[PDB]
Amino acid sequence: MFIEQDIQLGYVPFPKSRAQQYRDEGCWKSQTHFQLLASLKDRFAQRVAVIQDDKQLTYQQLYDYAIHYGTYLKQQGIRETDFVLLQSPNVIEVFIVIFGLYAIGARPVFCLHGHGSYEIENIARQSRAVGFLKLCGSANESTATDVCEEFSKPNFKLWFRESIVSRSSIEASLPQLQGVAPANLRAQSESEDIAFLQLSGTGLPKLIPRTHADYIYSIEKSVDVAGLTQDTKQLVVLPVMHNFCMSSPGFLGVFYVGGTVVLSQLTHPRVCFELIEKYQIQQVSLVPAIATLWLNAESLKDYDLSSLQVVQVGGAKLLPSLAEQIIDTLQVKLQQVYGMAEGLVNFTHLDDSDQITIQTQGKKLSHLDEIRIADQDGNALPINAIGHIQTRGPYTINGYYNLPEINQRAFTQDGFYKTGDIGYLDENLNIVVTGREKEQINRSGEKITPSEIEEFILQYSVKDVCVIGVSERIKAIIIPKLKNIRKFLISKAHFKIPDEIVVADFK
Numbered sequence: 001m002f003i004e005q006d007i008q009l010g011y012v013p014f015p016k017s018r019a020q021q022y023r024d025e026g027c028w029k030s031q032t033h034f035q036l037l038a039s040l041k042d043r044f045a046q047r048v049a050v051i052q053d054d055k056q057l058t059y060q061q062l063y064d065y066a067i068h069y070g071t072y073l074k075q076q077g078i079r080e081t082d083f084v085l086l087q088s089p090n091v092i093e094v095f096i097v098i099f100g101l102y103a104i105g106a107r108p109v110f111c112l113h114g115h116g117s118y119e120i121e122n123i124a125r126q127s128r129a130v131g132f133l134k135l136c137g138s139a140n141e142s143t144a145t146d147v148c149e150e151f152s153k154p155n156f157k158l159w160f161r162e163s164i165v166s167r168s169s170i171e172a173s174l175p176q177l178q179g180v181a182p183a184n185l186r187a188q189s190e191s192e193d194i195a196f197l198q199l200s201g202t203g204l205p206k207l208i209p210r211t212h213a214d215y216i217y218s219i220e221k222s223v224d225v226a227g228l229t230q231d232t233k234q235l236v237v238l239p240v241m242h243n244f245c246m247s248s249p250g251f252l253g254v255f256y257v258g259g260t261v262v263l264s265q266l267t268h269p270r271v272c273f274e275l276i277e278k279y280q281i282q283q284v285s286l287v288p289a290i291a292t293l294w295l296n297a298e299s300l301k302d303y304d305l306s307s308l309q310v311v312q313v314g315g316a317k318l319l320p321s322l323a324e325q326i327i328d329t330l331q332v333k334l335q336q337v338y339g340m341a342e343g344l345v346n347f348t349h350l351d352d353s354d355q356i357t358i359q360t361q362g363k364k365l366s367h368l369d370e371i372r373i374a375d376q377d378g379n380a381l382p383i384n385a386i387g388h389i390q391t392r393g394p395y396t397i398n399g400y401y402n403l404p405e406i407n408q409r410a411f412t413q414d415g416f417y418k419t420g421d422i423g424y425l426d427e428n429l430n431i432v433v434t435g436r437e438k439e440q441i442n443r444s445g446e447k448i449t450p451s452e453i454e455e456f457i458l459q460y461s462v463k464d465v466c467v468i469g470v471s472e473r474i475k476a477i478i479i480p481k482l483k484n485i486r487k488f489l490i491s492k493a494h495f496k497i498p499d500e501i502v503v504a505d506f507k
């Protein structure tokens with residue numbers, strides 16, 4: 001509907017032919033995030049959707065509160081297609097604010113709890129957001145206005161600044177709803193319109209526009225490969241604003257099948273063990289550093305963790321020995337997940353042998369996912385060859401939002417997203433992530449982002465550049481189309497200019 005305006009505002013859409021294929025093969029469906037919630041309330045009304053301390057929401061209550069909060073937002077002047085920044089810890093009112101935004105067609109911009117005002121400020125400008133919503137776990141935290149008082153330049157267009165303090169009951173956390181009669185809220189957005197912006201995972205974060213249809217599709221596929229059912233009890237320890245926690249399979253997957261999410265503000269081992277034993281949790285998603293915390297907690301022996309069935313681990317390199325240790329100590333099926341907020345997610349399978357779950361990051365979600373392992377010159381590589389992992393598919397973005405200069409470098413000519421990861425596809429077509437394309441260079445004690453230097457060098461006539469380190473020292477491989485490179489760089493951080501520099505191939 002609004003795709004005309006969005007394209008003019010920075011959105012890069014799916015190419016018309018690919019979009020039609022994802023329609024006809026039954027990937028993209030016709031439900032927005034909020035219409036999906038309305039149908040979950042239709043099917044699972046009185047089931048508990050979310051639990052946090054002494055607070056809980058059934059699917060019915062979540063729908064009502066969301067409707068009530070959307071009506072509030074509308075009354076305060078928030079409108080459809082507006083971007084609203086959302087920053088929140090792992091608190092239960094976050095689910096009311098997310099679907100409240102979806103109820104009026106507003107678009108969340110999911111900000112990790114922890115991003116300072118320096119990040120919020122750039123995120124707010126790049127997205128042209130009109131609102132900042134900051135959920136706080138306590139009253140001693142910085143409010144939305146507090147963060148905005150730290151901007152380096154005023155942001156007049158960000159006029160909605162509101163903080164929710166999570167309290168001992170939902171009703172007390174949301175007093176602004178008292179003077180509001182719930183509406184009959186009609187959003188005009190279609191499932192192929194932009195639902196939200198995510199942030200990528202170095203420097204200033206880039207905005208990732210995801211549509212309803214493409215995100216709900218990835219969630220449905222993750223629901224299948226994680227094997228979620230309406231009896232699934234999932235512990236949420238990762239930050240709720242993170243793509244992994246949201247959808248892989250995340251809390252939305254649990255909502256999708258009518259299960260129960262159990263929300264912990266804390267990752268501390270004892271707290272999580274207590275919750276697992278108390279609620280008989282069957283699944284949890286972790287990153288390797290949380291798994292290490294857990295496998296080395298002396299509290300381990302002290303709790304009944306027998307209900308545990310499946311542990312997702314993703315987000316960073318998982319050493320096979322630590323994957324092995326997770327299976328043994330916790331006595332679960334390990335499910336490795338190699339995903340990115342930009343799109344593609346890969347899962348190992350529940351019927352995969354332990355060895356597969358120990359050695360690989362599994363298989364793409366969709367049969368329409370395309371994974372290219374590219375050599376240094378862009379050419380596709382065969383099975384068991386390490387190279388640059390690039391991808392394109394029915395839920396993978398085609399451009400970062402309102403970032404045309406970065407987009408020209410982050411996607412191939414034919415539209416493959418360049419993950420920055422290296423690895424290979426093995427005999428079973430399981431992907432194995434071995435490392436990063438450009439690790440940061442450690443020159444005389446300082447850390448430098450190679451892509452940060454390539455970008456400036458691309459503005460020289462530069463046709464291709466790859467910056468790497470030898471000896472600790474910074475070298476710039478150039479493809480045509482030293483003193484002058486550095487001179488030009490000083491023209492625009494001294495400790496980053498190359499120490500040596502022009503070949504034809506190997507980028």
Ligand SMILES: Nc1ncnc2c1ncn2[C@@H]1O[C@H](COS(=O)(=O)NC(=O)c2ccccc2O)[C@@H](O)[C@H]1O
Nearest residue numbers: 201243244248314315316317337338339340341433
């Ligand atoms: N199993 C893994 N083994 C090694 N490395 C991994 C990795 N999983 C991510 N990475 C690295 O993390 C980048 C993405 O970062 S992310 O936007 O935060 N999204 C996530 O981590 C994420 C994780 C699970 C599901 C959805 C997600 O979105 C990737 O490019 C790669 O470099």
